Design goal:
The complex is a heterotrimer of chains A (128), B (359) and C (113). With 128 residues, chain A is mostly beta strands. Chain A has two helices and eight strands. Chain A is globular. With 359 residues, chain B is mainly β. Chain B has one domain: 7 Propeller (Methylamine Dehydrogenase, Chain H). Helix content of chain B is 1%, strand content 48%. The longest helix of chain B is centred in the C-terminal third of the chain and has 5 residues. Chain B is globular and about 70 Å long. Chain C is mainly β and 113 residues long. In chain C, strands 2, 3, 5 and 6 form a four-stranded antiparallel sheet that branches. Chain C has a two-stranded antiparallel sheet with strand order 1-4. Chain C is globular, with a radius of gyration of 13 Å. Classes of the chains: A mainly beta (128), B mainly beta (359), C mainly beta (113). Chains in contact: A-B, A-C, B-C. Chains B and C meet through strand 12 of B and loops of C. Bound molecules: copper (II) ion (CU). The site of copper (II) ion (CU) has 7 residues of chain A, from loops.
């Protein structure tokens, strides 16, 4: 339905490179699971949804936001939704209304944890 | 028996004659060590064992030698012990071990990974777990007193010579993060500069050409950036090119590790350069050493590089040491054109860092 | 096969260490008794044979002293510590049970993009 479970390991990898949401869904829910065993302080992961172009900018400010802010600038308008930073063996969840998808533009989910957005990034889209 | 073997002796040469060559011994990294030499005659004076990938620095007052290394109960297995050790500079003897969390940086000997504040009260080191942070060690108390996690996403330590306990670090956003410590070693305040360089388009080497109140950096493409911290906030500027059109036509670019140096009295900046540069040659041995006048932004001299990779400057004696990995070259830089005085061969098997004893 | 045991082999464009393929392992397997690092530095290498660029992941094999064979120090696309996972001047065994560096592997991830 409107649910998706994504994973992140000690190798800085997501088990998905693209997420698809069903148009019928009014609100979508994403679940993150850290399958590694390294502490969040050393190898934490999170998921940040934002317009493909805003990715880098968001990740940069998120880095300045710090861990206490889940590596995401507070009140950031460029972020559609984001999860909390979890450590090995931990899991988080995020639910956001799908009634905000800039028609014609691309969206991408990534990890704002310092230096991780490099590989841990994908393409989230609406429809089929 | 008249002759009797004795120990407990001090280094035979005065402190002002000593230099320290950090030999990583990469081929057998668990047996890295510091070699102490007399730069005036090339005599080997002694050494300090530093186990696995050791790092080293001399205390500001010149009385102690600080090392940082990692031990394991059985070397290749068993509990890990990251530490900072204090050794007596004259006797080259172990005196104290300071416990560190198991994440001190294990990597090549860039100066900025193991430093100390201007007032010598704290040792400031780089951590990587791989997440990065800066560690603070209180010398007097012999204790790890702070973990600057605000430095996450940044790299290396650049002490500000104009302040007692402040230092800067280069961050992934292309800017500089400044940290001001309290008298206890904990962070008292911090500030972030505007973007100095484009990480993607013109990455800079982390090695600074440090002045009293400002630092210069060179980029992979031969540009020069600046960070002025004479005031409250750090002012960044740049770039300006080290290259003229002829240099560019021949693809000259910087290359090395601790590849730059600044002679504060004259404003001259020294940099290792090589021709035919392209992606992947930023660590190439120097074909030449270029001497730049940071004031006029002109090149004032160029000499043979002797395949050097790292260097260090002594401000008072107007001396520059270059290192090609195994040999140390001593230069007199009182005049714009460096003058080779002597070469110390076989100073190490694999060293990328040499330092003068403070005077 | 001894083409892979050369520092010039295209997949080793960002290797700073010893080729595991000369140490009893292969480009994708650790020599017997050494432990794979979960983390690594990454490089974008050009395959001169098909003219395409690939992403290579440089995991280290740890828990044993320096292999000492086929030492390489190539720097294509390598960057400083402020771009940490593209940096090869650090021990990518740093977070292993035992951080002693043995050799470096060159794992092909996929086309660079
Ligand atoms: Cu992550």
């Amino acid at each position: 339905a409107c649910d998706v479970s994504i994973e992140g390991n000690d190798s800085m990898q997501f088990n998905t490179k693209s997420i698809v949401v069903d148009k019928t869904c009014k609100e979508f829910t994403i679940n993150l699971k850290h399958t590694g065993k390294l502490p969040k302080a050393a190898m934490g992961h999170n998921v940040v949804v934002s317009k493909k172009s805003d990715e880098s900018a968001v990740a940069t400010d998120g880095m300045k936001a710090g861990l206490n802010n889940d590596y995401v600038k507070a009140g950031d308008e460029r972020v559609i939704a984001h999860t909390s930073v979890i450590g090995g063996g931990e899991t988080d969840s995020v639910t956001f209304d799908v009634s905000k998808l800039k028609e014609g533009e691309d969206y991408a989910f990534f990890c704002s944890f310092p230096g991780h957005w490099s590989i841990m990034k994908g393409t989230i889209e609406l429809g089929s | 028996p008249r002759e009797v073997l004795t120990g407990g002796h001090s280094v035979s040469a005065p402190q002002e004659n000593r230099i320290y060559v950090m030999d990583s011994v990469f081929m057998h990294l668990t047996e890295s060590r510091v070699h102490v030499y007399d730069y005036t005659n090339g005599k080997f004076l002694g050494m300090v064992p530093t186990a696995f990938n050791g790092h080293v620095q001399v205390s500001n007052d010149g009385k102690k030698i600080y090392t940082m290394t990692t031990y394991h109960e059985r070397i290749t297995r068993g509990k890990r012990s990251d530490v900072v050790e204090v050794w007596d500079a004259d006797k080259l003897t172990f005196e104290k071990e300071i416990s560190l969390p198991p994440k001190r940086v294990q990597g090549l000997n860039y100066d900025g990974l193991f430093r100390q504040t201007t007032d010598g009260k704290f040792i400031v080191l780089q951590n990587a777990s791989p997440a990065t942070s800066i560690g603070i060690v209180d010398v007097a108390k012999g204790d790890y007193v702070e973990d600057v996690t605000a430095a996450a996403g940044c790299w290396s330590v650049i002490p500000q010579p104009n302040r007692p306990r402040s230092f800067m670090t280069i961050c992934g956003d292309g800017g500089l993060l400044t940290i001001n410590l309290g008298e206890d070693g904990k962070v008292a305040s911090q500030s972030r500069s505007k973007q100095m360089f484009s990480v993607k388009d013109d990455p800079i080497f982390i090695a600074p050409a440090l002045d009293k109140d400002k630092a210069h950096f060179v980029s992979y493409y031969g540009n020069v950036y600046s960070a002025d911290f004479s005031g409250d906030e750090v002012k960044v500027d740049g770039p300006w090119s080290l290259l003229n059109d002829e240099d560019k036509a021949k693809n000259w670019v910087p290359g090395g590790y601790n590849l730059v140096g600044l002679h504060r009295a004259s404003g001259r900046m020294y940099v290792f350069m090589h021709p035919d540069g392209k992606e992947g040659t930023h660590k190439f041995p120097a074909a030449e050493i270029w001497v730049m006048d940071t004031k006029t932004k002109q090149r004032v001299a160029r000499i043979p590089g002797r395949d050097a990779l790292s260097m260090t400057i002594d401000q008072q004696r107007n001396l520059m040491l270059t290192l090609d990995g195994g040999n140390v070259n001593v230069y007199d830089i009182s005049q714009p054109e460096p003058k080779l005085l002597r070469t110390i061969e076989g100073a190490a098997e694999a060293s990328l860092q040499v330092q003068f004893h403070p005077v | 096969e001894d083409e892979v045991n050369s520092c010039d082999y295209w997949r080793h464009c960002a290797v700073d260490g010893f080729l595991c393929s000369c140490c009893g392992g292969t480009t994708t397997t650790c020599p017997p008794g050494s432990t794979p690092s979960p983390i690594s530095w990454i490089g974008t290498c050009h395959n001169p044979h098909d003219g395409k660029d690939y992403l290579i992941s440089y995991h280290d094999c740890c828990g044993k002293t320096a292999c000492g064979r086929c030492q390489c120090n190539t720097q294509t696309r390598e960057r400083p510590g402020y771009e940490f996972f593209l940096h090869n001047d650090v021990n990518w065994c740093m977070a292993n049970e035992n951080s002693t560096f043995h050799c470096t592997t060159s794992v092909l991830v996929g086309l660079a993009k």
